[PDB]
Design a binder for this molecule. Sequence first.
Ligand code: SF4
Ligand code: SF4
Ligand code: FCO
Ligand code: FCO
Ligand code: SF3
Ligand code: SF3
Ligand code: F3S
Ligand code: F3S
Ligand SMILES: [Cl-]
Ligand SMILES: [Cl-]
Ligand SMILES: [Cl-]
Ligand SMILES: [Cl-]
Ligand SMILES: [Li+]
Ligand SMILES: [Mg+2]
Ligand SMILES: [Mg+2]
Ligand code: NI
Ligand code: NI
Lengths: 264, 264, 581, 581
Amino acid sequence: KPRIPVVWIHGLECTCCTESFIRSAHPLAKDVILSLISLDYDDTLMAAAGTQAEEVFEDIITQYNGKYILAVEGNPPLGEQGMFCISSGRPFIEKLKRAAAGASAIIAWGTCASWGCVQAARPNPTQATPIDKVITDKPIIKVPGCPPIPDVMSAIITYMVTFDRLPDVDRMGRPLMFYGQRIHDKCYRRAHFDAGEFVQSWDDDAARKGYCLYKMGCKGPTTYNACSSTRWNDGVSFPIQSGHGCLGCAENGFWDRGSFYSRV
Amino acid sequence: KPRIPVVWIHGLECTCCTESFIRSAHPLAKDVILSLISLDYDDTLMAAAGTQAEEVFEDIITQYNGKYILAVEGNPPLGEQGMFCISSGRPFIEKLKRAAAGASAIIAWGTCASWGCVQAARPNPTQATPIDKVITDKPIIKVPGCPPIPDVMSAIITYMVTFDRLPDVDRMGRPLMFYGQRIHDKCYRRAHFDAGEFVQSWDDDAARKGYCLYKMGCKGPTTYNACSSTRWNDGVSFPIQSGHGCLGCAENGFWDRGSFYSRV
Amino acid sequence: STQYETQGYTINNAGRRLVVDPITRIEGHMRCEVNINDQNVITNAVSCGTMFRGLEIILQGRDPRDAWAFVERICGVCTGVHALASVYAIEDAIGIKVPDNANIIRNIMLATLWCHDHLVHFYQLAGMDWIDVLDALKADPRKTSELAQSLSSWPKSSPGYFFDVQNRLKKFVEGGQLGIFRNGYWGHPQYKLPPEANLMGFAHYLEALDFQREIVKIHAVFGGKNPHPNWIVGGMPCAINIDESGAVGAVNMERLNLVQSIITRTADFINNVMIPDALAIGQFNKPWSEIGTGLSDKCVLSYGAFPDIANDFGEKSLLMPGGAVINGDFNNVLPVDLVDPQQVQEFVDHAWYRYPNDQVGRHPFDGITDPWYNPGDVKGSDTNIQQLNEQERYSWIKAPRWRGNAMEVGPLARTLIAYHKGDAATVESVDRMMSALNLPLSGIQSTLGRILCRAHEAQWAAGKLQYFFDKLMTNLKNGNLATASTEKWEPATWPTECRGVGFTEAPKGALGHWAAIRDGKIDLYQCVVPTTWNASPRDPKGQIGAYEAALMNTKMAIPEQPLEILRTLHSFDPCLACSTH
Amino acid sequence: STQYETQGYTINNAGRRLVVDPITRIEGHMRCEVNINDQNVITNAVSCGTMFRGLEIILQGRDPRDAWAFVERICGVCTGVHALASVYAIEDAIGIKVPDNANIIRNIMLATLWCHDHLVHFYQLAGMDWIDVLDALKADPRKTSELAQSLSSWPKSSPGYFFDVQNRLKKFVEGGQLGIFRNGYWGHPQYKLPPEANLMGFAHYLEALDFQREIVKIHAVFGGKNPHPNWIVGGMPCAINIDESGAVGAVNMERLNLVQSIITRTADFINNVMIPDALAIGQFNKPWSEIGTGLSDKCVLSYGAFPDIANDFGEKSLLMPGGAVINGDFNNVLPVDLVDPQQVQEFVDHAWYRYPNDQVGRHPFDGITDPWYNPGDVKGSDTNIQQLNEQERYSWIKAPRWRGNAMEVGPLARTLIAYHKGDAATVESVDRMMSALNLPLSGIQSTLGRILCRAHEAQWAAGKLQYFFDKLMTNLKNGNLATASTEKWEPATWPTECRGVGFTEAPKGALGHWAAIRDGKIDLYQCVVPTTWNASPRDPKGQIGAYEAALMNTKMAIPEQPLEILRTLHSFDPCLACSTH
Ligand code: SF4
Ligand code: SF4
Ligand code: FCO
Ligand code: FCO
Ligand code: SF3
Ligand code: SF3
Ligand code: F3S
Ligand code: F3S
Ligand SMILES: [Cl-]
Ligand SMILES: [Cl-]
Ligand SMILES: [Cl-]
Ligand SMILES: [Cl-]
Ligand SMILES: [Li+]
Ligand SMILES: [Mg+2]
Ligand SMILES: [Mg+2]
Ligand code: NI
Ligand code: NI
């Protein structure tokens, strides 16, 4: 039986969300690509380049008009007439608009596509702009994080294939399943927060006992994600477990909320 | 280069600690057996039986007198002159004392060897007795839990091999590395405990959001172990993560502290 | 010395007495004694459970909701099966019906345990009876690769792989620290595999030791941990949340994806490693299709298991058939009723227990567990058993009978019941398996048959895991998330007095828990466990149990080296902690 | 049209223009244009970075302690290396020395990233230039098994395995949904592997896609997550506790055990899968030892990496050597000083930036990042480019030079520097590799050589992972646990004005971050990244960068199918987000 067409495009980005996706432990990204979806365009992985890649893009968005999922990594820059990000000699934004017009639904992978991420941090030299300020007539599912958790990305994809519908979202368009609760509301160091048991300098005795990272700038109290529950890299760790406070990397504007080491 | 000799004996037990040991993810139990120790006696896994197994036991404790680690799973019963547990026609306690006399140190695996576990629960029909009430002249490391965590078992073995010393222990003989803190002091549901957000009946809306299990009888607040941090089965879960309160299974006398569903 | 006739056997305790104590590569504590005649053939066999803990006594006075957690600790090998039987028994007593997802998840827990228990038993417990590990050092790695590739599509077959495994074994042995291989039976004439098959089997022993840890990740997802996962009366505690806020605190799509990944890998390992190895052991050891028949051509018992209709324990629901055969009449598979006082009864005239009348058998609702260590004259002392006295009390295991008949339980028993009830999948699988070996159907009623049936069951259970997972996902697609019924959670809702039976097919065979509740507490809790049947001592008629029968009439090549005794006992997967509880 | 001479090339833009935009199977955005003569030979090559974000502008005014987290997001492929260069730069500026275990763990993070990046590049990015995936459907599974087993001890080689892989590919393409294989170059005459080697390589593509996720578990232990782990100025935040209360809150023996398990598996995969596949691509594609030389026989550059003596960045400390070769004189490996204003400079006369004088180069402590999109007289228009004008500004990539010379960086560059400095392990490895191919040492200075060196480096880094792990455990055995220096953590402890250089060898080559701190804030932060060097546009002398030079003089079989262009560009592992930052 045919697999759901997916077109994956890349604006200004660092490719972390693509790398996250391929870390998926269950299902393996191999099995997502071979058996669950038809990944029909993706600059990172596809054989074709140049005019052969342009032909794939055109062929898929034409033949599967109205029927493909558009995955977007990164964002369009409005500066220099969009030519801070060029594809096939034209502004990236034109490729984003063409791909968006034929899509059934749009997944905004990562904080870049969702909100702006590092290139939109002050002073935003390129005028990098999240997808939902350019595409205003299509369902957009925001999957924020820098990058989002590998097994969250694959679980969102399996949900859509298995249940044949988009995940239910909060008022910001984030899937309730993984973004409904704050990091701090499922943090294994919360006992120490509640007791006033804090790391005060790196590698102090508190740090060596896994005390709370609030006074070291942890932004877990204002960050919605699944890092303290689902965790990272097949459950191996997450930022706080390995001794660094949450940066707040799933939240809009997290680069410009003051130092990562200044308290929430 | 010779590997440290280990003699593993079994009193009254269910064999859960042996099963837990073979679950080890890192190092694999295979590599512990082939590369890290010489597992020279173990009724569950050894080729020899009967007189051939008695020959191995006698040869190893004689040849390596003073130089082997004795691992003990289960416990001796003092009832019926010890014949609630019979080894080569004689009370198990006799084999325990012979093995203990030649050991450099003893690992008491599990709540059975450490404290008593289920056979010692009221009314203790066999007079099941923990190892440290019988063997009083040897170092005994208690590794409690029903069973202890697989990767905790293998980490204690690798510590002893790598560092050539016993783990440092608390006042009850438990390794500080894995038993120094309570389950409730590293529990990812502690935010809900602090907020008064409790499961009140199974599968209620609170249970479906991962609220705290205190009112369902969780004994995390009085239990020392690594289940809420290291977790179980290669980090996949632990009791509370899958929706059941801690039973208290690492603590002495946990079967007789009231109903598992009565509050701490 | 004496002689008497029972069940077609001549029980004769003349001749040399051999003692095997301890039995190793089992769970828990067992002693076996035999007598052999001048042709080194067993004419008497004595099965002895050498441990007791008293869970039936400890359960008195507990809260019925807690019982599962206590009785789970009957055994860490068949971990979970006693918890399942317990929640079934308490739900049967009170009158609780669980939601469909709880039933499906319980079936997943049980199928997971079947896969894990059968695989570890094949390799780590029984395998070294069939594979001469030290002989693997003589194998040619290229011929090993060729053999493996002829039997399976399994990827891991390169000559360099088999050379690396062989070299690891060589370096292990070279310093004389042979560990679990020390003082083994290596080179015994009953080891019949060629060196290449020994090296293939040894490589797979190591692969299975690694892989088995992954299977129980399913128990960790739904049950928190393995060994000894968690359960509740009323369903399971693993609340589901797929598409709502807080799914991070519940069984969500990521958790289910983990379960699916394990199922696939579990089927792949069993189908391409364990199944071909079982058929290879059969190909090289065909004479063992005629050894250790015991009661398997006389009397076999299954209660049945895996209710596919939630809260329906009837024949149309159970995916694993129940029934009994006696007197070798496989054309009349009889129905089993665990409430009927004339069906399951336990005797103690040859066991270390007190009854008011030791000449009668007690149904478990009339059960008594009053320990009485009384070995009589054992040619030593009460604390030095040199020879058990099988004319009197000789075991901590009670003697279960069905309508007075001594029965075999377990994979071979279940396979014969399903085959003779005309289960299509079973008939086709068994006929194809025995055809592949160029053996008659009767060859399954043997020590080799017990091993082949266990491998067949691991494959069946790996298939059923996917079936159950798909059933769960269908319910979630339809918005049916419920995992617990709590209408009768509170003791004020229970009957003042009630009783119930929980039953299933554990990996070793028919399991039952009989519970009576009074005034909110356990008044009586009696367990009859598969190894209790199989390892049973004698009854007032002198009838012998499954192990004693299977050992009768067996030739031993070398009396002092009990390889043939170990092969047959290990073929039943003895679980002595289960048997005694 | 114009023609000029530079570096032994005739740059001629007469004749047919070919455009490749987008370049795929890279990170980020690249455009390439070439001119080809009547003989289908490239006479002109144009490297264009088609993205910019401006991290150097964004970092102004930030707290130096935060800088690593911003610049880490230069790239998610080489994730971590910019964080490492950043903490090195800030520590160099302020005068911070980290504890030994922090340095060892940073070396582990870098070695982990080398293994991961090199493996994924080999299979997922470059592999399909060499392996004809659709030709794998014609292979014989038994001949594929025989080939794989002739090359490697790797276990996963059974005929059934290769059949199963082949059938998965056959099923994938059967619905006409070819996904990433659609409209590829399959059947191009430059595909030289036989069908069995295609199927072997395709099977390994899938094994590598699965296995790469495990490598980065080492990043998750020490750095919390991958991609984009966490770091600190002063060391690492992953406090260690082996034997004290609360070790469950720190890097403990169980966490170190997980790291060791990953190291062994990573070495085994690289040594037995990637290494033999790289040699097989060499054996079937020997002509590519003479194609794509570019600058690799003229000018190569390494800064060096992996300081083994904590806080010592000198030649006696760095385990991966530094040095520069110019003028093709490999007898004169020159020392590199990243503070010397006459050594590293960047030019922008051919890039989209403003300088006060675009005819001179600026050392990064004098760097300027003032973006100016001015493509001038293109064919087309400024928002619809048909042809860049390479006689004016044509890229978002600045043009770095070393003492005015255009240099190649990356695995081939490092291999040549280490070989010609007499590093014993490098000389042995390279000699054994080129002996196995029957090729002269000059064969490494090529497109094929860049791939062979990358595979050699993955093996080197997997070995170093064990070395560093063992050093860490030696410190812990000695009671040396420290992972952070905090005496200069607070801004009031810093110099009011200071500057520093942080440098390393990222997987793609020489990386530097130049930072100036004033009044507690970043005053200047300039990055020069390895793909900045390799993908560089021209300078005021018209000197071409490594990509443009490696493309010069390349024959194309089919002008409309850029397979040869992709082979040579992919051999450098282009990271365009890195190049532009
Ligand atoms: S470490 Fe961060 S998320 Fe966790 S309890 Fe402390 S402040 Fe909250
Ligand atoms: S679930 Fe148990 S251990 Fe966790 S916070 Fe609640 S009471 Fe404490
Ligand atoms: N299987 C199993 Fe254990 C036994 N006998 C139980 O029940
Ligand atoms: N490696 C890598 Fe990325 C590039 N170029 C960096 O630094
Ligand atoms: Fe995966 S591209 Fe990486 S920067 Fe923060 S989300 Fe963006
Ligand atoms: Fe591992 S034997 Fe299992 S009962 Fe509680 S520890 Fe005991
Ligand atoms: S920094 Fe990001 S990865 Fe999770 S812990 Fe905080 S949201
Ligand atoms: S029941 Fe035991 S396994 Fe851990 S969570 Fe509680 S100590
Ligand atoms: Cl794109
Ligand atoms: Cl943002
Ligand atoms: Cl023992
Ligand atoms: Cl206890
Ligand atoms: Li320094
Ligand atoms: Mg009983
Ligand atoms: Mg720069
Ligand atoms: Ni059991
Ligand atoms: Ni990069």
